[model samples]
Target: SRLDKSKVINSALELLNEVGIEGLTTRKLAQKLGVEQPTLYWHVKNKRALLDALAVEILARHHDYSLPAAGESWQSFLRNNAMSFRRALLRYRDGAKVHLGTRPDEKQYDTVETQLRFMTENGFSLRDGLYAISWVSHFTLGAVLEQQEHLPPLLREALQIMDSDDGEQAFLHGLESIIRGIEVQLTALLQIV
Candidate 1:
């Protein structure tokens, strides 16, 4: 029983790689994990909770976020953050689907506060820092959302360019655009002050 929770979570991640988000079911998971449905239910309630746990697992996998240097620009900080998030999302099937809307559990919220502090300490107003972080977070989520299969034609063509070949280059380009856009607005806001 001491190992049940972690084992279930680990098996669920394996199931995610094998069956993906849409096809992931507690009963199916129970079958493969050699645990009963009640076991998974003890850890997660429904598809949403399951996806949230998956998102947490993915976040934990991407856990090495350090604060940027004092001289680092907001643009660079967000870029690095975005890159880490993008790479983590690419690691699993339907990763973005699991991550995009999930609520942050305790440790995740702490990390968010840390990133926010890094930005605020570097001269961004609290509001601007929050804006910058949210912009980057949403951008990374949406961009990786394009990397999934079974997309519409338009998105398929987009992935051909945006997510091609490991998706690093294209993801960086888009991330720069977002950071630049956030930079401009934040700079302008400071100017007005």
Candidate 2:
């Protein structure tokens, strides 16, 4: 029933699209919405609350990032999820950074636990699952964040190093390597099972 919080959240998202995380501040948001600064405080008590809300908002936009289908290898599964997340990041300016900034509430996950369970059940060690999940997530976040920058160095280098036009393909080139390495490890893991 409160317009203040509703308006604040909605306006914050809009402000994010217009400016960026750094630019989307209470002072600016209030100015954009034609609301007084106190009205924004009535919703989000502090900047941290606002930032956390923005992080959750970004996640909510692409919550459908799915698990791999039955019959999929973990490698392909990860690639699909990786690309799914990166594509979601591509939808919003600084999406990766926004997401990386906050610790999503445990209730927010689709999550690392799901994959860890699948991995262990399918032959991966718990240690392997933990590290693998962390690594893959880091790689995806690192890649997407770089891709978002203005004239990212990786993009420049990829263009120069390869005579190819698709920058995306170049990213996949590396993503595949990481996946392949893990695939081999998993296959070897399965051999004795």
Candidate 3:
């Protein structure tokens, strides 16, 4: 094959680690792939498209806990999924940046639909369920973005903590707090029914 789309995306991922998102140009990816820009373009139309693919690919590869396991509660799923999401976003240089603005791909449709159904099945209205998912996602994304930043020492200590354990604990506390809030809402909602 002159160029394989999957191979292009794979090489782009490797290139992403080396250059970070800001530096990941299609031209550079082409050079990394040892192909002409035109050939790379045939696979990914432009940088935006390349990122969209990268975003979805990243999730597909690294987001293992996105779905609930057998007999898991909604609360557990949300917590595990959020942790998985944060890990995935932190897996590459500017990985969160790659995911920040990209649209969800069709490949995600079934997974999302199943997630929403699981929420409704577990007693959440669709709107509230979507809100819960959004909240968890936004919270996790912001946490990773902060973690990824190169900040000055005093402020960095405030956010980053002295070690990864402290940082992870802080993140866990925040995650649990959000889950507790949702549990309270769920209780109130069930009472209304």
Candidate 4:
């Protein structure tokens, strides 16, 4: 029989949807695939490799790093890229968590290249471009992690325990304040250098 890596990855993704990261295991994946555990092992070396492959597959589904058409500013390019990445993270169950530690493989070079191009175009040196890319990715990843981990009842309970007049509204306002601070920093960078 032909080896179907896609089928294995698809089944693994489905298992992720059904049973979060903690519950996923080689035995479980094998069971889902209706094959011996060794079969899965043959395709994916281990759980870590499986997770890395899954992350790559998910990222590959969206995100082509072609340069934007003429007239697209660096800011717009980054904004769209960030938004698309965020959307992809939101698509799968625990997607942000799944993608957290997986380093980009060879296929991800285009994404890196596009980010570098945007940075160089915006007056940043190559090193600065890499730093900016790292900073924005960390920021977006942290935000997505917070959003995904925010369980509804827990959020409500925390708000109630705080005993604030505006409750959740106050929390949201605090987030807005942080965003404003980031915007200020960005503006300062643009002005100064």
**lDDT ranking from best to worst?**
3, 1, 2, 4
- Misplaced by over 4 Å in model 4 are 1-3, 64-67, 151-193
TM-score of each: 0.80, 0.82, 0.88, 0.74
lDDT of each: 0.76, 0.74, 0.87, 0.71
Tell me the lDDT of candidate 2. Answer: 0.74
Q: List the residue pairs that clash in candidate 1.
A: none
Candidate 2 vs candidate 4, TM-score winner: 2
Choose 1 or 4, whichever is better by TM-score: 1
Candidate achieving the largest TM-score: 3
Q: Per-residue CA lDDT of candidate 1, range 82-134, in tens?
A: 77878888888988888766877887788778888888777688887888788
Worst 10 residues of 2 by lDDT: 158-167
Residue pairs with backbone overlap in model 3 = none
User: Measured by TM-score, how close is model 4 to the native structure?
Assistant: 0.74
- Per residue, candidate 4 scores C-alpha lDDT tens digits across 70-169 of 7776555655566667667767778889888687787677668876887677666788677656766676677777766755988888767556542334
Task: Give the TM-score comparing model 3 with the true structure, all chains together.
Answer: 0.88
User: What are the per-residue Cα lDDT tens digits for candidate 2 across 1-193?
Assistant: 3346666777778888899878777888778777788976776777678878777766666745646568877777778877777777767778888888888766456566777777787778999877877787788788788877748999988668556532477668878888777778877865653
On a 0 to 100 scale, what is the lDDT of residue 91 in model 2?
A: 73
Q: How far off is residue 114 in model 3, in Å?
A: 0.9
**Residue 154, candidate 1: how far off, in angstroms?**
14
Q: Residue-pair clashes per candidate, as listed? A: 0, 0, 0, 0
Could you tell me how far off, in angstroms, the CA of residue 120 lies in candidate 4 after the best superposition? 0.6
Residue 65 lDDT, candidate 2, scale 0-100: 60
